Amino acid sequence: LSSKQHFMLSLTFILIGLSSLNVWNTALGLNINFKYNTFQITGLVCSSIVALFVEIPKIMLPFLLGGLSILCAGFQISHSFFTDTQFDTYCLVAFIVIGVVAGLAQTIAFNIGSTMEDNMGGYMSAGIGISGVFIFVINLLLDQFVSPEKHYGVNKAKLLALYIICELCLILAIVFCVCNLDLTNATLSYMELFKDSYKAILTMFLVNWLTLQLFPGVGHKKWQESHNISDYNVTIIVGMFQVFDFLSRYPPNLTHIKIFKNFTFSLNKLLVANSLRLLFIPWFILNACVDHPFFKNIVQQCVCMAMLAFTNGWFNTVPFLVFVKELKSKGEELFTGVVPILVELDGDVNGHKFSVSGEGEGDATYGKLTLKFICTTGKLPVPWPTLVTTLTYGVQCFSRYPDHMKQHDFFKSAMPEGYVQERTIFFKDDGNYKTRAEVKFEGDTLVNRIELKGIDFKEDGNILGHKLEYNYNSHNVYIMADKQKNGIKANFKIRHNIEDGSVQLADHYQQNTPIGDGPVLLPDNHYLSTQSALSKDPNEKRDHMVLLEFVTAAGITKKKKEIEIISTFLVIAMFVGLFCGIWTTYIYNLFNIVLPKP
Ligand SMILES: Cc1oc(-c2ccccc2)nc1C(=O)NCCN1CCCCCC1=O
């Protein structure tokens, strides 16, 4: 699969989005009356549900685009040829049919994406914003070279220029998307799905019951009718809305960057904090009614519109990225990012006392460990590979588990609670180690405090003689559970290469028990396959080494329609909210918001 066709299909999909949103973008930028907007919204929201619930044929893309082209081409001729009286009827009919056609085209275009391997939805998300910014830039550039003749309350050159631009864009898109994207060719109840997760539908409805209530009608129509703003300024408020509506959609998508770590948080908190947006309502009434001079500046209106635009595109795409995470064990969320690790060891072997400090990072998603270990007491009388079992295998929380087995581990849930691990290490023909360690969150850093006692070690043995080679290998740690202590048991024998070619066996019996009072996930028999790499950093002088660890669990060898149904429910809810958030503005007609004529 070459990338040339990848880029070509990406460009085709972007062009589809461009020509789909160009009509609305150019119909909002010339302060057209409210009735045409409400008719267009009604058509767009009435066609889409019917198109969604029933599988329509997938062959009507070029015909729909051609119909849109001829409908838009009709406007320029009709506006001059027709007298305004019958021109109104043509406007309303064209707007209704344009709404229906655009809804049908967008719905049929979205469905064809999921069938292909790559995700297409991001491409429509990009294309809509690109259309908005492109129309705004074109309008701003054209504003400085058009005579304001004001034939029927609308500009003359602006209409022709914008509509021929739209026609050229649509014809390019249709001629570019035809030679691609070929078009040849147990059950469960639904109510429990609806009542299981309703925390997203309410937010996705209430965040669009307001934005489309305000910006169409009360956004700048009332302000223009009150303060009589110059025509040269109305083209800037809508642009300041469009640009930020486009730009405030990407930051929630990416989070691995350090600065954007606090954007996608939760739903209950989102629902209880969404009431901060309701403060916007008195602001528009206040700046439309009060005549005091501090409010008669373009800057504050632009700031308010920019704030509304930024808050619209950030409380609208969040639910699409959170519900899957919270569908459902507790404790895995603390494994999503890279977690720092601090290790402190105080050991005593055959009367030799020592302290070791180590720092590093762990990545549970990759299941990899990187660590630097240094001796704070100087040089160590015993080899550090012998303490590797103390250092790294004393922390198994960062091990990568397969998604099938991910719920099995207790390490995932215990680490927020903290746990205590004991280990008995037997060296063949030598002494033994007894190690007690605790691993638990200090601040935002996982810490491991370990005390080691070494006994019965011969002075001429492989350990005290420093006969161990500088290398480490791959092994398997066998883990079973113990119900009596509500903990886990583990056995593993580590082989150590000797400089003379021989092999030293070190048996390790390990018992892990949780520290906190919360319940744990008691597993069955399984093993962890681990690979260790030792390296020396030449830039430091003290006794130090770098340890890299690759851990993977093993031992033991549908329902996507629920996610599909949830996504469809969210989309339907958002469309219903958008429809219901237009007529509500007529309620404002009761109060005499408009300023007196003088
Ligand atoms: C993201 C998305 O997904 C879907 C979809 C999902 C599943 C099935 C079928 C369709 N539609 C959209 C979408 O176009 N939103 C913006 C729409 N409008 C109305 C047009 C211009 C302004 C008002 C507005 O903001």
Numbering used by the authors: 30 to 214, 228 to 370, 372 to 600, 612 to 652
Copy out sentences from the published article reporting this entry, exactly as the authors wrote them.
P. falciparum nucleoside transporter 1 (PfENT1, encoded by PF3D7_1347200), located predominantly in the parasite plasma membrane (PPM), is the primary nucleoside transporter mediating nucleoside uptake from erythrocytes. Crucially, PfENT1, a member of equilibrative nucleoside transporters (ENT, SLC29) family, shares only 17% sequence identity with the human equilibrative nucleoside transporter ENT1 (hENT1) and is unsusceptible to hENT1 inhibitors, which provides an opportunity to design inhibitors targeting PfENT1 specifically. The overall structure of PfENT1 contains eleven transmembrane (TM) helixes with pseudosymmetry. Here, we report three cryo-EM structures of PfENT1 in the apo, inosine-bound, and inhibitor-bound states at a resolution of 3.3 Å, 3.1 Å, and 4 Å, respectively.
To decipher the inhibitory mechanism of GSK4, we engineered PfENT1 with internal insertion of GFP between TM10 and TM11, termed PfENT1GFP. More importantly, GSK4 binds to PfENT1WT, PfENT1Y190A, and PfENT1GFP with the same Kd value range of ~40 nM. Furthermore, we determined the structure of PfENT1GFP in complex with GSK4 at 4.0 Å. The overall structure of PfENT1GFP presents a similar conformation as the structures of PfENT1APO and PfENT1inosine-bound. An extra density appears in the central cavity, fitting with the GSK4 molecule well. GSK4 interacts with PfENT1 via polar contact between the carboxamide group of GSK4 and Gln135. Trp53, a conserved aromatic residue from ENTs, forms a CH-π interaction with the 2-oxo-1-azepanyl group of GSK4. The benzene ring of GSK4 interacts with Phe139 via hydrophobic interaction. Compared with the inosine-bound structure, GSK4 partially overlapped with the base moiety of inosine. Therefore, GSK4 is an endofacial inhibitor blocking the alternating access of PfENT1.
